[PDB]
Structure formats: C-alpha cells, structure tokens
C-alpha cells in the first residue's frame, strides 16, 4: 500500500536535469512581477522554502497579490464533481513568466489602430480575425521534367 506525505511519489519530478545542478541564475532574481500577469510554475529542487504542492507543477495561473519574495496565484480545480478556486503561495525562484498570451497581445495592438479609424471614416471595425487554413490552391504546371515511379525494389 501507498502513503500520503506532502512529497509522495516525487522521485522523477523534483529532480535536476543532466548537467544542470546548482543554484538559480541572476535573471531569476532580477525579474519584476505585477498583479494580473500570467505566470507558470516550475519547481527548483535546490530551494526548500516557498515550494508549492506537486499538483501545481507545470500549471499556469494569474497573479492576485505580490509580496517581498513571494506571489499569490489563483487556480481552479475539480473536487467532488464541482469547480473550486484555490489560492497558492509560491516563492519567486519557482516561477517563470508565461508565454500563453503572446499572440493575442499582438492582435490587440493591430485592433487598437483600426478601432479609432472606425469612428472617423467607417462605423464598425474590420477587426482582423484569424481564419483556419482553407482548401488546396490551384496550380499551373509546365509539364517538362517528368519523373516515373515503379515497383522496381523487389524487397526480398
């Protein structure tokens, strides 16, 4: 039978990668955080204070409050077939800034131009949506340089 301590089953998780042992780099400490940013959790096994519980490893959430050397992040979780919000305390050594909003922020920068012109000249924005890839395109071909294919390889 299995046990139920705070760091159960973390032999693979919570171990350093090959040729990457030691303390964190300066960039870790010089990064500034703000309320409302999206942030991503990855535990560093060498630091023993401010570690989250291993369920949260590799998950992304939103910063709710900022303190001297730690952050409070909001998560959601299913328990007993219902949704529950959870507020997780994490030290700054175990977090990295998330990339999940990157494309959306670029798109907002384009929208922000159009939405002004749409008051002056038009009435409503064109709004620049994405579209999924359509059907295969048409082609005009010169028809020299033909290559033949054959079952010449007998494959003993």
- Annotated binding residues for Mg(2+), written as ranges, equal 9
7 binds RNA (CB under 7 A): yes
Contact with RNA (CB under 7 A): which of 33, 64, 97, 100? Answer: 100
Tell me the two tokens of residue 154: 């007998």
Q: 23 has which bridge partners? A: none
Residue reference for tokens 């780099």: 25
- Count CA within 13 A, CB hemisphere, residue 93: 13
Tell me the two tokens of residue 102: 């990157």
For residue 11, give the DSSP letter.
S
Contact with RNA (CB under 7 A): which of 35, 64, 69, 113? Answer: 69
Contact with RNA (CB under 7 A): which of 34, 36, 38, 140? Answer: 38
108 binds RNA (CB under 7 A): yes
CA distance 153 to 156: 9
In the complex, minimum distance from the CB of residue 138 to RNA, in angstroms, rounded to a whole number: 20
Taking the least distance from each CB to RNA, the nearer of 83 and 144 is 83
Stretch that binds RNA, among 68-76, 116-124, 135-143, 144-152 (CB under 7 A): 68-76
CA distance 101 to 38: 8
Residue ranges in 126-155 that form contacts with RNA under rule CB under 7 A: 127-133
Stretch that binds RNA, among 85-93, 116-124, 137-145 (CB under 7 A): 85-93
- Write the burial class of residue 94 (CB in 10 Å: 0-12 exposed, 13-18 middle, 19+ buried): buried
79 binds RNA (CB under 7 A): yes
113 binds RNA (CB under 7 A): no
């Amino acid at each position: 039978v299995s046990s139920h301590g705070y760091r159960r089953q973390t032999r693979n998780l919570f171990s350093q990668a090959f040729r990457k042992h030691g303390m964190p780099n300066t960039s870790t400490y010089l990064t500034q955080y703000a309320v409302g940013e999206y942030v991503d959790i990855k535990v560093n096994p060498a630091i023993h204070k401010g570690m989250p519980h291993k369920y949260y490893h590799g998950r992304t959430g939103i910063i709710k409050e900022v303190n001297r050397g730690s952050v409070i992040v909001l998560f959601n979780r299913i328990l007993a077939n219902k949704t529950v919000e959870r507020k997780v305390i994490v030290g700054i050594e175990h977090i990295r800034k998330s990339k999940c909003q990157d494309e959306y922020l670029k798109r907002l920068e384009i929208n922000k131009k159009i939405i002004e012109e749409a008051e002056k000249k038009g009435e409503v924005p064109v709004l620049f949506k994405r579209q999924p890839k359509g059907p295969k395109p048409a082609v005009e071909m010169l028809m020299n340089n033909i290559i033949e294919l054959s079952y010449d390889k007998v494959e003993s």
